[PDB]
Design a protein that fits this description.
Radius of gyration of chain A: 7 Å
Number of helices of chain A: 0
Distance between the termini of chain B: 41 Å
CATH topology of chain B: Serine Threonine Protein Phosphatase 5, Tetratricopeptide repeat
Number of helices of chain B: 8
Shape of chain B: globular
Distance between the termini of chain A: 21 Å
Number of strands of chain B: 0
Radius of gyration of chain B: 15 Å
Main location (chain B): Golgi
Largest sheet of chain A: none
Protein name (chain B): ADP-ribosylation factor-binding protein GGA3
CATH architecture of chain B: Alpha Horseshoe
Order of helices and strands of chain B: HHHHHHHH
Keywords (chain B): Endosome, Golgi apparatus, Membrane, Phosphoprotein, Protein transport, Transport, Ubl conjugation
Number of domains of chain B: 1
Shape of chain A: rod-shaped
Helix content of chain A: under 10%
GO molecular function (chain B): phosphatidylinositol binding; protein transporter activity; protein-containing complex binding; small GTPase binding; ubiquitin binding
Largest sheet of chain B: none
Family (chain B): Belongs to the GGA protein family.
Largest interface: A-B, 7 and 16 residues
Strand content of chain B: under 5%
Oligomer: heterodimer
Chain lengths: 8, 161
């Protein structure tokens, strides 16, 4: 339960 | 559906946030800032709700509102324990801060004050919260991408490691 790092 | 966020729990916590982040505030009203932490400490889903609420206020287009939100977020880190730390240490929350500083997202329409305070907090957390692995992952990536060139100076005292 958590999203993936927001790769910018 | 959306949980307690849509219920009285959420409405109450956002009501407390409005007060603590009202852009009319002459200055920081700690009567409302700390009171928000207390509500979080008594609520079963206080941390989950709170961080989503804080993330939203921080992404506000209005400077003073976002800044006070960052102050409340700081207060919560020092007054809401591990249970709060653990929710901030998830990408679900951290990606929201990243949008504030990355030009590919909100980055271009956010004052420099806000973005630097956000950087200072993330960094400060890597020093103070080593067991929150995801926070440095988010920080180092901001470095690896030139958003953060050099670690910033931060407020420190004897209680900080």
């Amino acid at each position: 339960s958590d999203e993936d790092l927001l790769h910018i | 559906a959306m949980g307690s966020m849509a219920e009285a729990e959420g409405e109450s916590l956002e009501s407390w946030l409005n007060k603590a982040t009202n852009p009319s505030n002459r200055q920081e009203d700690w009567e409302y800032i700390i009171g928000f932490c207390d509500q979080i400490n008594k609520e079963l889903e206080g941390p989950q709700i709170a961080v989503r609420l804080l993330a939203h206020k921080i992404q506000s287009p209005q400077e003073w509102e976002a800044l006070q939100a960052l102050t409340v977020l700081e207060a919560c880190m020092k007054n809401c324990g591990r249970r709060f730390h653990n929710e901030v240490g998830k990408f679900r929350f951290l990606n929201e801060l990243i949008k504030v500083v990355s030009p590919k997202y909100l980055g271009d329409r956010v004052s420099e004050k806000v973005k630097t305070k956000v950087i200072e907090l993330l960094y400060s957390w890597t020093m103070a919260l080593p067991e929150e692995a995801k926070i440095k992952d988010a920080y180092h990536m901001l470095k690896r991408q030139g958003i953060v060139q050099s670690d910033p100076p931060i407020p420190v005292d004897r209680t900080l490691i």
